[PDB]
């Protein structure tokens, strides 16, 4: 094609069936992989089109794109999708018939193989029965790209450490000609640096990292210990949030996250009695009550659901005007995911964490118990340190003064976000200072 972008748009349309890219960022990433002069790191949430960023460029390349993916279930999802698009995609694994195995190995030995995209477990990629095939592919210069999917699996500080992933670096170096595309949904900066080092990515690494920052979310922290009427404070909070078309009255809905079922039940009643209708949602309820509560919340019959973290996964509601954490979350990640259910329609929403040192001490305690249980059962691990530090970053978020968006950015590894008087601290630095000084005196 006269224009490389025109061929990319063409293939995205003709093969994959999309008129545009989901985001400028997915576009930029895909284009950097096509240009092929840089190793590429892509860190985008599950559903943000990571796959395409290597799958489309794989099709516009001379040769084969090997895609290392950690477990067979994940491979199969994409193989089947790619087969619906009549893409020449193969998978080498031991969940196969020994016949299919040799049919493919033969196809890979051909000068001009049928296979365009080869999905493979890291186990398979390091196994000696595959080494000959790998070598002839390397020798013939028949690899266009090496792709390492679920790249965080290389990090002991990530959530899913796989020793198998430690070997992928040696492999990467052998494929000098083929650029490496490493992808994950979840990487703190420390996991990023492990991905960059442990996979021997060639600097300069092009990074495409979906930021946390949403311009329409107002984050604040309130100290339960500093409030005479906590339930009253929450009620005013929910009402202000829902009362953003004064003429029409209550519009939108909200979520209030609590650690325990007991708390969900009681807090729902306390709010209802104080003039904001609310219902509890938690896994203790019968399946049918959950679907009635969710439904009532979804239909805006009851505007406020008070739930455990068991609520939100399977829900698309775009006019959540507020998420309030009544108890601090297990982790900054949790808090981000939960608070972030607010404001999906882009209109102003409010995320408020109700911090108490008592909650903090209780969650800190329960994290140290469940780590101990794991340390007894499957022995000591560096991920336990990351779990504790995951809580700590949220404790820190509550107990320090600074832009709240900035603190979430620091933790996930985003740039300083354009918080436009969009958090308590940026809107009134002194007010937050006062509350922290005041919380100091409480002990």
């Amino acid at each position: 094609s006269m224009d490389p972008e025109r061929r990319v748009r063409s293939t995205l349309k003709k093969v994959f069936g999309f008129d545009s890219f989901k985001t400028p960022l997915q576009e930029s990433a895909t284009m950097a992989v096509v240009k092929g002069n840089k190793d590429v790191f892509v860190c985008m949430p599950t559903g943000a089109g990571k796959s395409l960023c290597y799958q489309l460029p794989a099709l516009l390349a001379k040769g084969i794109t090997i895609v290392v993916s950690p477990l067979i279930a994940l491979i199969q999802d994409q193989v089947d999708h790619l087969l619906t698009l009549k893409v020449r995609v193969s998978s080498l694994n031991s969940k196969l018939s020994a016949q299919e195995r040799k049919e493919l190995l033969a196809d890979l030995e051909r000068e001009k193989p049928q296979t365009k995209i080869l999905y493979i477990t890291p186990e398979m990629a390091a196994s000696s029965s595959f080494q000959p095939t790998l070598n002839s592919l390397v020798s013939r210069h028949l690899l266009s790209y090496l792709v390492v999917d679920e790249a965080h699996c290389v990090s002991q500080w990530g959530h899913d450490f796989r020793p198998d992933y430690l070997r992928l670096g040696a492999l990467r170096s052998r494929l000098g000609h083929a650029p490496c595309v490493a992808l994950t949904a979840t990487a703190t900066p420390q996991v990023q640096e492990d991905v960059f080092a442990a996979l021997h990515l060639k600097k300069p690494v092009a990074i495409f990292k979906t930021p946390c920052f949403r311009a329409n979310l107002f984050y604040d922290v309130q100290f339960k210990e500093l409030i005479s009427d906590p339930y009253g404070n929450l009620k005013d909070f929910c009402l202000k949030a829902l009362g953003q078309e004064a003429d029409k009255g209550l519009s939108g809905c909200g979520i209030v996250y609590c650690r325990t079922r007991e708390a969900c039940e009681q807090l729902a009643i306390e709010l209802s009695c104080r003039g904001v209708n609310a219902k509890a949602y938690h896994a203790g309820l019968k399946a049918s009550e959950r679907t009635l509560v969710q439904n009532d919340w979804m239909e805006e019959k009851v505007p406020v659901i008070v739930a455990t973290i068991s609520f939100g996964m399977g829900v698309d509601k775009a006019n959540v005007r507020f998420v309030a954490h009544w108890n601090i979350a297990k982790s900054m990640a949790g808090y981000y995911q939960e608070s972030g259910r607010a404001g999906r329609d882009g209109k102003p929403s409010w995320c408020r964490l109700y911090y108490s040192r008592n909650d903090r001490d209780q969650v800190s305690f329960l994290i140290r118990k469940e780590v101990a249980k794991l340390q007894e059962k499957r022995g000591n691990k560096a991920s336990d340190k990351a779990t504790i530090m995951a809580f700590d970053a949220l404790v820190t978020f509550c107990e320090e003064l600074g832009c709240r968006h900035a603190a979430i950015a620091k933790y996930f590894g985003d740039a300083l976000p354009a918080c436009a008087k969009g958090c308590d601290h940026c809107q009134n630095p002194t007010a937050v200072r006062r509350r922290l000084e005041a919380l100091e005196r409480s002990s």
Partner: nanobody
């Protein structure tokens, strides 16, 4: 990309001190390691001192006890205090900002190594 500018070079009597600075500018989230190298003309480049983000420091055996590397992350700037200067310390001193993570609010960034032009240290 990143500008690494060195400062604080000079001509100084043996036994005297210098303080070199080294400031990275750009959309810097983090620097894995900042290392001071020195290069006398027609000699092999030499490792002087390093500091990780984390504040772990390491010195060449030749300068241990005489030089201190320090940093101000607020300014992505590392300092090399050089005391008891010897003529053997005469060289061009330069920085490596190794594992430099840059990032725009758009989510587009880089991981790369960056290098200073250097600063002249002569010890009579």
């Amino acid at each position: 990309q990143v500008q690494l500018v060195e400062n604080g070079g000079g001509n100084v009597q043996a036994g005297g001190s210098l303080r070199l600075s080294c400031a990275a500018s750009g959309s810097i989230f983090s620097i894995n390691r900042m290392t001071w190298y020195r290069q006398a003309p027609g000699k092999e480049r030499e490792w002087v001192a390093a500091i990780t983000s984390g504040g772990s420091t390491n010195y060449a055996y030749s300068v241990k006890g005489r030089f201190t590397i320090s940093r101000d992350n607020a300014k992505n700037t590392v300092y090399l205090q050089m005391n008891s200067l010897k003529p053997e310390d005469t060289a061009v001193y330069y920085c490596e900002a190794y594992g430099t993570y840059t990032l725009a609010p758009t989510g587009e960034g880089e991981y790369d190594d960056y290098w200073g032009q250097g600063t002249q240290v002569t010890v009579s």
